[PDB]
């Protein structure tokens, strides 16, 4: 049902026009394809999930023979259209349906794909991407090749304040002759369980970040079911830890060079912004101490994430957690 | 599957402190209860999909003697916390579960709900409410007790030349490489298809409104699956026409008076707004002209309506038409 509402969002040119207004996510993938130029010329390509077909046309642009673009929602008519009026019907082939189903009538040299969703994971379409590699010869290429998931603690007591802010309205002892107070709790509770997608300065960050590598020419579908990332920061500043701050980075690791497209709070601001997970309750730690634990991500049914996180300050023992919905995030841009 | 993500939603404190302040709604609904204390007072009521319960709590003011509050989301586990910290367990009860499904053990006296959505029946939870009736005594009374549907033609050039500028993306000729153009058509029909929810100065209404009037006391649940409503408009201002303009009341018709919830461009705005929706091509009226035509909805399975709007100058013949997808609204306001 989540995937049937998944497929009707897309199939919006006015969506997919929003995603092709992100003149980072448009660039990098053009010279990424480009730069390697040599790695399509000549070759076989399947483009998953193609939208508005775009990548399939960067992919002619480097002289690919052949692209087999596959889209499940209503887009892959209007795909169709533009394959059309760009003169490209010899060498771009829109087949509507899910790669899952569809029938491809060969392998493939090279699969590319925009997979990546809110903290890399998020939507779970790197899964369909993974299952793509049924279709790929075994000396076959993935653009992207490789994904980064970057995690750092980061201090910011506005942002922890607002969660109280926000529920202001439940603290009234007197509205129209209720007492709304006992749920002030609930309230604040809710807020604190939506990761925050938005940007920030990279000050509020207080260690170097922990990575997690998804090799994606080596990764199962099933993998992402489960991703479990333990972390120990080596804390920088001194200060109240309230929460983790998340980003990633794709590469495209070609024959003649490797690309690489950041979401880090470091690198031109994305559609994807950056993520925050709040704790429940902030940590004290002091510049030297070494913060440690774990961050649980675990598929659901909604094509989203529950987000675990567990956290301590090795020095003193204080912990503290928290379990969020990446179905819920909070917009704060 | 529809059904699921509007329970979801609906479950969120968030969502209801959203709707809770609006002080037009807060406001209107205590007066018509507590003005009309007299129908309420040792009386049964049942409140369908109460969310927070505050409309039960009103009806405790009036001095109700049994309150049953039905509500199927995870808002009534809250509900439920304010009905005992209200020290009010003797006289609400809360019942989780779908009004359709729950077992009552009691007829009741009279019905209390807000169950309007955009151009009063969108998220079609009227039906719900009609259903409820099956509860209700022959002598009992429904608060809401009618709802007036109002529509009227607009002019408002600025609304229709947005609708192509919205869409500039798709007109470029040159984008990395692609031309885009053959999709500009595609992108700005699927604009002139969404239903804007914005408020508007009433200086672009061309003529009095039609209005159309639901019963609640008299209305099947299935009466509102397709409603069509012919209209003949004679029009006071000379300009193009570019759609129609929709607005609703209800009104709470109690034994001491009569109360009116308003969402009319003439009165303060509420969260409601007012919806327009735009004709294909606009029309030409001349004050003294007559615009006749009709506004069909069909209820759809995504809780929604289909709305198919056709339109003539009978003195021209000059005629548009559009269908809308009131499940996908432009929100411009
Ligand atoms: N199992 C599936 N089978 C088939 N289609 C599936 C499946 N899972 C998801 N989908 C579709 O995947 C799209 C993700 S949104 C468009 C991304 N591609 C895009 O912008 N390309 C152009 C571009 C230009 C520049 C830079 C990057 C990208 C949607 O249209 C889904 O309907
Ligand atoms: N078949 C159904 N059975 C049971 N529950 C159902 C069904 N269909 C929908 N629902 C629920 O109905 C709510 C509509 S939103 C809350 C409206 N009530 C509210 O604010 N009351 C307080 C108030 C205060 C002032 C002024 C007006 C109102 C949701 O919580 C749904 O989950
Ligand atoms: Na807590
Ligand atoms: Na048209």
């Given at each position: ?19 092709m ?28 999930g ?18 087999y ?58 899964e ?46 007197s ?24 940007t ?23 993998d ?42 470091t ?26 634990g ?38 704060r841009?």
């Amino acid at each position: 049902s989540s995937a049937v509402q998944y497929f009707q969002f897309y199939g919006y040119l006015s969506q997919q026009q929003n995603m092709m207004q992100d003149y980072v996510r448009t660039g990098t993938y053009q010279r990424a394809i480009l730069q390697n130029h040599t790695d399509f010329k000549d070759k076989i390509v399947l483009d998953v999930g193609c939208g508005s077909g775009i990548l399939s046309f960067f992919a002619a642009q480097a002289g690919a023979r052949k692209i087999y673009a596959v889209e499940a929602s209503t887009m892959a008519q209007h795909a169709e259209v533009l394959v059309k009026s760009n003169n490209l019907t010899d060498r771009i082939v829109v087949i509507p349906g899910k790669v899952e189903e569809v029938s491809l009538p060969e392998q493939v040299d090279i699969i590319i794909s925009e997979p990546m969703g809110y903290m890399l994971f998020n939507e779970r379409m790197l899964e369909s991407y993974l299952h793509a590699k049924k279709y790929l010869k075994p000396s076959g290429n993935m653009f992207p090749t490789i994904g980064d998931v970057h995690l750092a603690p980061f201090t910011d007591e506005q942002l922890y304040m607002e969660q109280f802010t926000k529920a202001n309205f439940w603290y009234q002892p007197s509205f129209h002759g209720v007492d709304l107070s006992a749920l002030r709790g609930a309230a604040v509770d809710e807020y604190f369980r939506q990761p925050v997608v938005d940007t920030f300065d990279i000050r509020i960050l207080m260690a170097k970040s922990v990575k997690y590598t998804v090799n994606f020419l080596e990764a199962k579908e099933g993998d992402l079911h489960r991703i479990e990332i333990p972390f120990k920061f080596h804390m920088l500043h001194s200060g109240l830890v309230h929460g983790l701050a998340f980003w990633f980075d794709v590469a495209f690791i070609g024959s003649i060079m490797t690309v690489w497209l950041s979401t880090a709070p470091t690198e031109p601001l994305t559609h994807w912004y950056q993520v925050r997970c709040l704790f429940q309750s902030p940590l004290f730690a002091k510049a030297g101490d070494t913060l440690s634990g774990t961050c649980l991500l675990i598929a659901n049914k909604r094509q989203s994430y529950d987000i675990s996180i567990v956290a301590q300050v090795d020095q003193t023992g204080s912990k503290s957690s928290n379990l969020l919905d990446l179905k819920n995030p909070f917009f704060r841009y």
